């Protein structure tokens, strides 16, 4: 069967502009009032939602769908990419966003990500926040330092939270040249230093019989 994606926006350029490019994904249907969507009986595999509509807050659209429907994916589209607009797409429990005004090749390159990987931009674990688009970490509502490759594992550790990723297999996928396996510990070390309260009973990033490692939500 083809994709569902609905588009609720109430710029016609932006449904125009955004339907055409998502075509070539699947079957699109576009919406310019908050109403409007909450009235079609029909489920889409993924929601296109302005923060901003005419009737309802894009934020409050996206919580029933997720209370609703939590299988749905809901990208965001917003004006702004602060810190406090983005904490409160996690709040309503956005996938992803995208700051407006944006090339729509964009959009669809997230939706991919949806679809084809099943992934997203916004990984909510409480306390721990991960935007994977803006690539930014927050504990407690407060964006933290990361350096690049400590981000890249903690984000690869939480995209396969519950399973167990094997220092062999860090050591393979995020370094270009041959490394000392301490290497990975060494990463984990300053990982775990930078998000849990107390870097020696691990709420987050788990030892594993001593040969992996594993993120737990």
């Not at 969507?37 to 769908?65: K, Q, T, W």
Request: a neutral charge; glycine letters at 6%; one cysteine or more.
């Amino acid at each position: 069967m083809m994709w569902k994606i609905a588009v609720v926006d109430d710029d016609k350029n932006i449904l125009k502009k955004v339907s055409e490019k998502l075509q070539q994904l699947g079957r699109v249907k576009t919406f310019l009032t908050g109403e409007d969507f909450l009235n079609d009986e029909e489920a889409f595999h993924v929601v296109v939602l302005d923060v901003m509509l005419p009737d309802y807050s894009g934020y409050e659209i996206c919580r029933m769908i997720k209370e609703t429907r939590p299988e749905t994916w809901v990208i965001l589209l917003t004006l702004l990419s602060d810190d406090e607009s983005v904490l409160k797409g996690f709040e309503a429990g956005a996938d992803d966003y995208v700051t407006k005004p944006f090339n729509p090749e964009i959009l669809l390159a997230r939706v991919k990500r949806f679809l084809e990987r099943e992934k997203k931009g916004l990984y909510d674990f409480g306390d721990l926040k991960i935007d994977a688009t803006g690539f930014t970490v927050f504990l407690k509502g407060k964006r933290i330092h990361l350096p690049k490759k400590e981000f890249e594992i903690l984000l690869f550790l939480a995209e396969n939270a519950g399973k167990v990723v094997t220092r062999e297999k860090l050591l393979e996928t995020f370094w270009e040249d041959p490394v000392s396996p301490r290497v990975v510990d060494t990463v984990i070390k300053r990982i775990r230093k930078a998000i849990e309260d107390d870097p020696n009973r691990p709420r987050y990033i788990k030892t594993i019989w001593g040969v992996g490692y594993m993120f737990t939500g």
